[PDB]
């Protein structure tokens, strides 16, 4: 029997199973089955993505709900990790989702750590610098979600760039069937990336963070004279602030290889403000 | 769709092909039966194919492609043998209609990039000394399986570590496919078949049924326990002219970290002259 699913109302489901028997039922009478992958503390970015989701014609929207273990250093605290179920809920129940996966550590994992995914090299690069073995735990937790849904489309934010570029090999390389789409990151009215972490941020390192999104925002502008020139100005803005401490701060080109002297790329940074570190990205088009 | 006639072997290269025509049969009430090769077909694949066959409504598709990947080095790759016309005459007589034959370019156009990281049995026995061997096989066993998108796939149990390692696959990555092991088919004599048998000259061939010969005596010895069983055994191939056992051992059934507790399966891989030969038997200890 395929387990109950009550149309216009927020359906809970913690086992894979239910999820993956409702949604294959769903898929075979008309709907368009759209994911949504999320760690929970959902703020607006997140519901970007909901919204993007939703307005595909004959959408069921489906939102996960799973801290990951497997994507936290040896030194991220996953315990930690903010956690507000009920009001999450409420959330995705005020925007008309149907479908929320909340599964434990132990459904996800019941043999715990053995088949992985390996991403590629770039996976070792900007992020993967201080958290070596974070995106294999990312994108071993979405191939599995995306085997337990089977969403036509799955929906990421563009916050986290690097993330969704490994997510897009991921589906290449794998030879997923399934859409990836990119959603705009959502931002503060000052241009600062929203994020569960700018909470921690102090008055002066809010302030100061403002930064990263003007330093983008300059490089781009800045692009019609040249990637020096983007750069340069980029530069000049995280420059012209206090406690940031720049990690790094890469011209690519949009699939994360080499950014070319001509053409469209992706400008990345990384800074860190007092213990909370903070990423931005933007699209950047040179000449 | 591309063309597909009924009743016809019809040969595909292109995943994109074989992936469309696939997902059209799976619409209209077909179930597909994926069994995947490497070629130089002799009459244990006939045995999956025949198993693939028996399933009701099914539609048979026979993958031909020898994966780079799972190889070490290009002298083994160069050296796996390759009778293209012949595997496809005998798919033609088993009434296969579908053949999947994909180039080296259309399923690694980007090399080797995002891959599937084996558990840690894939370090032990056949991987020991070949380290990214299984990994190799993983990760084009999962490709596969994402463009064919079976209802169930065939593996023989001869190569029976790679069996449980793509059952590992499956229930790791939660995918939506039935993994079915078919027996090991022997010659008239015990030995199991292979593609590497046909580089046994007249002597070697002769000497080969020991592991066979062991590995029924094992099963029989078993009545009086572990220590019974592997003796026999050992005394059968210690009795063979020119047989280098590699390793002889006896496991739990899942081959994993756990001890040997009434059901068992008893390994042996030997080389006889530059052939290296594997067989495997389930055993009962005490039964
Ligand atoms: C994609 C994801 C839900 C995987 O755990 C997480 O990395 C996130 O929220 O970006
Ligand atoms: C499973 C397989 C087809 C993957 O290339 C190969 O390892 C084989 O023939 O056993």
Redesign the pocket.
Request: charged residues 5%.
């Given at each position: 029997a395929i387990p109950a699913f009550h149309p216009g109302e927020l359906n809970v489901y913690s086992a894979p199973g239910d999820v993956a028997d409702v949604s294959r039922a769903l898929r075979l009478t008309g709907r368009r089955v759209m994911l949504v992958?999320?760690?929970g503390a959902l703020h607006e970015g997140?519901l970007a993505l909901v919204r993007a989701a939703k307005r595909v014609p004959g959408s069921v929207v489906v939102v996960?709900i799973?801290?990951?273990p497997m994507?936290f250093g040896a030194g991220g605290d996953l315990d930690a990790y903010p956690r507000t179920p009920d009001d999450d809920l409420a959330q995705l129940r005020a925007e008309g989702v149907e479908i929320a996966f909340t599964p434990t550590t132990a459904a996800m994992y019941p043999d715990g750590l053995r088949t992985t995914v390996q991403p590629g090299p770039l996976a070792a690069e900007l992020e993967g610098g201080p958290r070596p073995t974070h995106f294999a735990?990312?994108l071993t937790?979405?191939l599995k979600?995306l085997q337990i849904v089977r969403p036509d489309r799955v929906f990421?934010?563009e916050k986290?760039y690097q993330?969704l570029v490994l997510?897009r090999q991921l589906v290449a390389d794998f030879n997923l069937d399934v859409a990836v789409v990119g959603v705009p990151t959502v931002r503060e009215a000052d241009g600062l990336a929203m994020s569960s972490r700018n909470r921690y941020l102090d008055p002066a390192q809010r302030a100061a963070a403002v930064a990263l999104s003007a330093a983008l925002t300059a490089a781009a502008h800045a692009a019609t004279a040249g990637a020096q020139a983007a750069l340069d100005a980029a530069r000049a803005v995280l420059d012209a602030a206090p406690g940031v401490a720049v990690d790094y701060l890469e011209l690519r080109d949009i699939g994360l290889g080499p950014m070319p002297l001509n053409g469209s790329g992706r400008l990345l940074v990384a800074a860190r403000l007092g213990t909370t570190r903070l990423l931005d990205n933007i699209a950047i088009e040179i000449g």
């Open positions: 992958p999320t760690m997140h996960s799973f801290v990951n994507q735990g990312v937790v979405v979600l990421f934010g986290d993330q997510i």
